[PDB]
Design a protein around this ligand. Structure first.
Ligand code: NAP
Ligand code: 15M
Length: 319
C-alpha cells in the first residue's frame, strides 16, 4: 500500500475503506468491518457525521491500536462536516463532537461533505411538509476559514472539500488571506463518470482527487438513478477482469490508481474487503487504460436532479 503526498506535506494512503452503509444495516457491522478492513491491509478509513457510525469506526481504530496491530500514525482517518453545519460558528463544535464520538484527539482529514448548505438544526435532512429539503445560504469561504482554524488548533491534520466543482474550488483558492488550500476534493468518480477535466484541474492546483462510488455505488433504490447501468456489469471491465484474472471491481479501482486518483472502496463483506487490497498486485496497460477512458458517460449514480435548484448544486457546470 503506497501513499500520496498532500499539498500539506502529509501522506494519504491511495487505498481507502468506505464505511458508509444504509440505516437498515445494523450499526454493529461498522465496528466489525472496519476492523476486518484494517486487518486486511486498509490504512485509510473514510467516515462522516452523516454515516452515524463514528463511534463504531473510531472504536474499531482504537481496538486495532490497543491489540498492537497498528499505531495511530499508521491509520489515516477522515470524517466530514454535514451541510447543516456549514455556518462558521458550527464548524469547530461539529469537529469536536466527531472527535469525541470516535474518541480520537485529531482527525487525519476533515472535509466539507458537500457545497450545498442545509437548514441548521437537529435533522440531518431537514424537510418541509412536502418532503422537500430545506436549503440554507452560507458563504463557503467563511465555512472554510472556520475549517482552517480547526487545522491551526491541531484538531485536523489536513482539511479539504468534497463534491466541489471547478468554480467552487477556485472560489476557495482565490479567497483573500487564504491560509490552507484544501488537500483534496472527494467526488464521485468511476469509469462512467471519470471526471477528467476536474481531475486535471485539481492536479494543476496540487489538489488530489479522491474517488467515491468507484465500484459503481451501493445502488440504493431510494437514492440511485433508476435508469443507470450497473458498473460492475460493464462488458469492458469484465473483459479486462478476464484478461488480468481479476474482478471488475479490482479493474475499476486500479484504473483510478494509475491516473493518480486516490480510490475509496466500501464493502461490508469480509471476502470482498480482502479482495480489494489486491489492487496493488497487478497493473493495466496503456491500452487497457485507454479503453476504460472511453467508458465515460458523465453519469453520476446519485439521483440529485431534485436538488439542481440548490444554488450550490455542483453538477450545473461542465465541471
Ligand atoms: N462525500 C460523498 O459525497 C460520498 C458519497 C458516497 C460515498 N462516499 C464514501 O465513499 C465510500 C464508497 O462509495 P460508495 O458508498 O458508493 O461505495 P462503492 O465503493 O461504490 O461500493 C461498491 C459496492 O460494491 C460492492 N463491492 C465492494 N468490493 C467489491 C468487490 N471486490 N467485488 C464486487 N463488489 C464489491 C460493495 O458491496 P458489499 O458491501 O456487498 O461488498 C459496495 O456496496 C463510502 O463508503 C463513503 O465512505 C462519500
Ligand atoms: C450533488 C453531489 N453530491 C453531494 O453534494 C453529496 C450529497 C449527499 C451525500 C450522499 C447522497 C445520498 C444521501 C442523501 C442525503 C440527503 O438526505 C441530502 C442530500 C442533499 C440535498 C441538498 C443539499 C445537501 C445534501 C443518502 O444518505 C445516501 C446517498 O448517498
Amino acid at each position: 500500500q503506497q501513499c500520496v503526498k498532500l499539498n500539506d506535506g502529509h501522506f494519504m494512503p491511495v487505498l481507502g475503506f468506505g464505511t458508509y452503509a444504509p440505516p437498515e444495516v445494523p450499526r454493529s457491522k461498522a465496528l466489525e468491518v472496519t476492523k476486518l478492513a484494517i486487518e486486511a491491509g486498509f490504512r485509510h478509513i473514510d467516515s462522516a457525521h452523516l454515516y452515524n457510525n463514528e463511534e463504531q469506526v473510531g472504536l474499531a481504530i482504537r481496538s486495532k491500536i490497543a491489540d498492537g496491530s497498528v499505531k495511530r500514525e499508521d491509520i489515516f482517518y477522515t470524517s466530514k462536516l454535514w451541510s447543516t453545519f456549514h455556518r462558521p460558528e458550527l464548524v469547530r463544535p461539529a469537529l469536536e463532537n466527531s472527535l469525541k464520538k470516535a474518541q480520537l484527539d485529531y482527525v487525519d482529514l476533515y472535509l466539507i461533505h458537500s457545497p450545498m448548505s442545509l437548514k441548521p438544526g437537529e435533522e440531518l435532512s431537514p424537510t418541509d411538509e412536502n418532503g422537500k429539503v430545506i436549503f440554507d445560504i452560507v458563504d463557503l469561504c467563511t465555512t472554510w476559514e472556520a475549517m482552517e482554524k480547526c487545522k491551526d488548533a491541531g484538531l485536523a491534520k489536513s482539511i479539504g472539500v468534497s463534491n466541489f466543482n471547478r468554480r467552487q474550488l477556485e472560489m476557495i483558492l482565490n479567497k483573500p488571506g487564504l491560509k490552507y488550500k484544501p488537500v483534496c476534493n472527494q467526488v464521485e468518480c468511476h469509469p462512467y463518470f471519470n471526471r477528467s477535466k476536474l481531475l486535471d484541474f485539481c492536479k494543476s492546483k496540487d489538489i488530489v482527487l479522491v474517488a467515491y462510488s468507484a465500484l459503481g455505488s451501493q445502488r440504493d433504490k431510494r437514492w440511485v438513478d433508476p435508469n443507470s447501468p450497473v458498473l460492475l456489469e460493464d462488458p469492458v471491465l469484465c473483459a479486462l477482469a478476464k484478461k488480468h484474472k481479476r474482478t471488475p471491481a479490482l479493474i475499476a479501482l486500479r484504473y483510478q490508481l494509475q491516473r493518480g486518483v486516490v480510490v475509496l472502496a466500501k464493502s461490508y463483506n469480509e471476502q470482498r474487503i480482502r479482495q480489494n487490497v489486491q489492487v496493488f498486485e497487478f497493473q493495466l496497460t496503456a491500452e487497457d487504460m485507454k479503453a476504460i477512458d472511453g467508458l465515460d458517460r458523465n453519469l453520476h449514480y446519485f439521483n440529485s436532479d431534485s436538488f439542481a435548484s440548490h444554488p450550490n448544486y455542483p453538477y450545473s457546470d461542465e465541471y
